[PDB]
Design a protein around this ligand. Structure first.
Ligand SMILES: Nc1ncnc2c1ncn2[C@@H]1O[C@H](CSCC[C@H](N)C(=O)O)[C@@H](O)[C@H]1O
Length: 233
């Protein structure tokens, strides 16, 4: 066993100490931990780098257990900063990076609703998946991405109706208590706001992402799903 490898005994001990996992943990064909009741990272990374082939410095928001972070880091020559709001999730992600020897990744605790994004430097693109519907002011998160980058890969839900919605900063919003079924995926505020489709596209435009490419969309009168690439000047 190469000197760069963590001992399997220690992989086992630490993976157990880190339970419960959200997406589980497997390494060398050994399933150490199972995930919870609630895209494949390699496929997401492929789509991300189809959109941003020249990217060498990436910001990932809401890194969870580091699965996308690791997939994005496979290519040498690209460095990733992953931000995660829940310390318990971050500790998992840090363990994953250590087990895999992913030295081109940095992980940091951060609350995207309060962080000063101007402290982070510049990125070729921002990955923002599974996060926009966990914040109070989603338009502001999009503005923060634009402060540091000209590209965003955004995967989010939006709300399929405009009827009866509230209005904040001119956007139509569904304002609800944060009750996402996976507790370890929840936002850091008691509440969240979802956007209707028009307000999501307006918020992208108003942040500066004036060119929007839709990669995937599933519509309903209620929960909708979308993946878009936003590009700013
Ligand atoms: N305000 C906030 N600041 C930073 N991270 C947050 C946050 N609100 C939620 N998160 C984190 O964002 C993640 C949401 S689940 C999405 C995980 C991953 N991006 C994916 O697409 O599969 C969780 O790890 C959660 O703890």
């Amino acid at each position: 066993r190469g000197s760069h490898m963590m001992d399997r005994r220690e992989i086992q001990r630490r993976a157990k100490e880190l339970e419960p996992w959200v997406n589980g943990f497997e390494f060398e064909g050994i399933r150490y931990a199972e995930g919870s009741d609630h895209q494949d990272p390699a496929d997401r990374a492929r789509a991300f780098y189809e959109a941003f082939p020249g990217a060498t410095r990436i910001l990932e928001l809401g890194a969870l257990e580091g699965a996308d972070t690791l997939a994005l880091a496979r290519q040498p020559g690209t460095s990733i900063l992953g931000l995660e709001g829940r310390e318990e999730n971050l500790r998992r992600a840090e363990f994953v990076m250590e087990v895999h020897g992913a030295t081109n990744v940095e992980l940091r605790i951060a609350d995207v609703e309060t962080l000063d994004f101007a402290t982070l430097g510049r990125f070729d693109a921002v990955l923002c998946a599974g996060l926009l519907y966990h914040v109070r002011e989603p338009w502001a998160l999009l503005k923060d991405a634009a402060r540091v980058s000209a590209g965003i890969y955004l995967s989010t839900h939006y709300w399929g109706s405009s009827d009866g919605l509230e209005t904040l900063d001119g956007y139509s919003v569904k304002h609800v208590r944060e009750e996402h079924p996976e507790p370890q995926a929840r936002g850091l505020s008691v509440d969240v706001r979802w956007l209707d489709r028009a307000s999501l596209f307006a918020a992208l435009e108003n942040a500066g992402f004036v060119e929007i490419e839709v990669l995937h969309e599933r519509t309903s009168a209620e929960v909708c799903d979308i993946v878009v690439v936003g590009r700013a000047r």
